A paper describes a structure:
Finally, the crystal structure of this construct revealed that the BRIL domain is rigidly linked to the receptor 7TM domain by two continuous helices connecting TM5 and TM6 of the receptor to the N- and C- terminus of BRIL, respectively. We initially attempted to determine a structure of ZM241385 bound A2AR-BRIL by relying on the rigidly attached BRIL domain (MW ~10 kD) as the sole fiducial. Despite extensive data collection and image processing, we were unable to either identify clear 2D class averages with sufficient clear structural features, or generate a reasonable 3D reconstruction, even when we used the low pass filtered crystal structure as an initial reference model. These results suggest that a BRIL domain alone, even rigidly attached to the protein, does not provide sufficient features to enable particle alignment of a GPCR. Following the successful strategy employed with hFzd5, we next added an anti-BRIL Fab fragment to enlarge the fiducial marker. Apparently, the larger fiducial marker successfully drives particle alignment and yielded a reconstruction with a global resolution of ~3.4 Å. Further focused refinement improved the resolution of the transmembrane domain to 3.2 Å, sufficient to enable model building. The cryo-EM reconstruction of A2AR-BRIL/Fab is almost identical to the X-ray crystal structure of A2AR-BRIL, with a global root mean squared deviation (RMSD) of 0.9 Å. The ligand ZM241385 is well resolved in the ligand-binding pocket, demonstrating that this strategy can enable visualization of drug binding. Furthermore, we identified a lipid density with two aliphatic tails and a polar headgroup between TM5 and TM6 on the inner leaflet of the membrane adjacent to A2AR, which was not observed in any of the previous 58 X-ray and cryo-EM structures of A2AR in the Protein Data Bank. Based on these results, we conclude that a Fab tightly bound to a rigidly attached BRIL is necessary to serve as a fiducial marker for single-particle image alignment.
Residue numbers in the entry: 8 to 250, 267 to 398
The structure:
């Protein structure tokens, strides 16, 4: 039962995520910093699928060996999880930068810096993974009955997770800080990302609404005064929207508005409306082209952000229950120990996470869809 599902999930991990690594290599279209991060995460998934499943299946029954080796068997999954969480945080930061500040996105994001951050986060993940090895372990604590049952020699120690790895260390430091604080920061980042996109779309629509309504009032107006009032709002909206296509269009538009305002200050309303009709051409052409490009660009950014948010949510909801039951067991010693059959089920769910990643990229991103069908 348990042995069957672990092997079944393991096989889907390699072949499922090797395509994601394969796709980034045989498709120049899908190659950027976000893909570099997600392929680092995919390499972490490859590593967990290849190694942790045999490690879990051999530690589930028992494999007596040196205490350091057994501790490594248990910390390898944790380091491959910390790598994934760091990669997800980097992805979230990349998306926030790209959407909030598109002008400086290319300036502040570079491939060399992305590779450097990937290396830094991987070695940092190794730091947490190897932290229990050095000094913080439970090797010194005797288990007489156990070591007699498995026939443990002096050098070799039996493998039993909860009694070989520091439970208090795990529950206190491993969960709280380096899981949650990344998760809370990531949630705040995603909320900020969506708020920024909504605000930007609202601002563009408001500027278009002003540049249309004021013009309509211009033809539907009279006795100057209102004309000079409306062109002031036109200038304000045009400058705000501007802050070769966009620049030249807005320069021509503000020049025409200045001409109309200068010609209407003298009191010549007929040619004031003539100049408004003159505006009506540049408005249509350049402003409509700019708006149609901007809306599609923002929609694409929002779609990418939603995809990555879904990946994050799946990661969190797959790695949450195990830690929750672990901290429940730690903080209620008087409570009866959690059932073995349920604990194994939760571990299966956690490892399942690696399988889920390629399915999202094969179902939502059309760029990966074509190349997977190619294979
Ligand atoms: N609680 C736990 N158990 C095991 N394996 C030991 C299975 C077991 C659990 C309870 C029992 O009474 C006898 C055996 N691996 C485990 N890995 C983790 C883990 C990975 C990341 C965070 O926690 N927790 N965890």
């Amino acid at each position: 039962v348990y042995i069957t599902v672990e092997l079944a999930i393991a096989v889907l991990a390699i072949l499922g995520n090797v395509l994601v690594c394969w796709a980034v290599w045989l498709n120049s279209n899908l190659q950027n910093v976000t893909n570099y991060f997600v392929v680092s995460l995919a390499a972490a998934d490859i590593a967990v699928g290849v190694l942790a499943i045999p490690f879990a299946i051999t530690i589930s029954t028992g494999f007596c060996a040196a205490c350091h080796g057994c501790l490594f068997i248990a910390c390898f999954v944790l380091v491959l999880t910390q790598s994934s969480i760091f990669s997800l945080l980097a992805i979230a930061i990349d998306r926030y930068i790209a959407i909030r500040i598109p002008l400086r996105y290319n300036g502040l994001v570079t491939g060399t810096r992305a590779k450097g951050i990937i290396a830094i986060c991987w070695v940092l993940s190794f730091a947490i993974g190897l932290t229990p090895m050095l000094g913080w372990n439970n090797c010194g604590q005797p288990k007489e009955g156990k070591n007699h049952s498995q026939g443990c020699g002096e050098g070799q120690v039996a493998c039993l997770f909860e009694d070989v790895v520091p439970m208090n260390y795990m529950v206190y430091f491993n969960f709280f800080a380096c899981v949650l604080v990344p998760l809370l920061l990531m949630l705040g980042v995603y909320l900020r990302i969506f708020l920024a996109a909504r605000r930007q779309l609202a601002d563009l629509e408001d500027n278009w609404e002003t540049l249309n309504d004021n013009l309509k009032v211009i033809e539907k107006a009279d006795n100057a005064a209102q004309v000079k009032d409306a062109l002031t709002k036109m200038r304000a909206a045009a400058l705000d929207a501007q802050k070769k296509d966009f620049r030249h269009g807005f320069d021509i538009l503000v020049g025409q508005i200045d001409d109309a305002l200068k010609l209407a200050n003298e009191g010549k309303v007929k040619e004031a409306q003539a100049a408004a009709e003159q505006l009506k051409t540049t408005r249509n052409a350049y402003i409509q082209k700019y708006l149609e490009r901007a809306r599609s660009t923002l929609q694409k950014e929002v779609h990418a952000a939603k995809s990555l948010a879904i990946i994050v949510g799946l990661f969190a909801l797959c790695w949450l229950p195990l830690h929750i039951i672990n901290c429940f067991t730690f903080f209620c010693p008087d409570c009866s120990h959690a059932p073995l059959w349920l604990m194994y089920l939760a571990i299966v769910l956690s490892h399942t996470n690696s399988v889920v990643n390629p399915f999202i990229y094969a179902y939502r991103i059309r760029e990966f869809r074509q190349t997977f069908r190619k294979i």
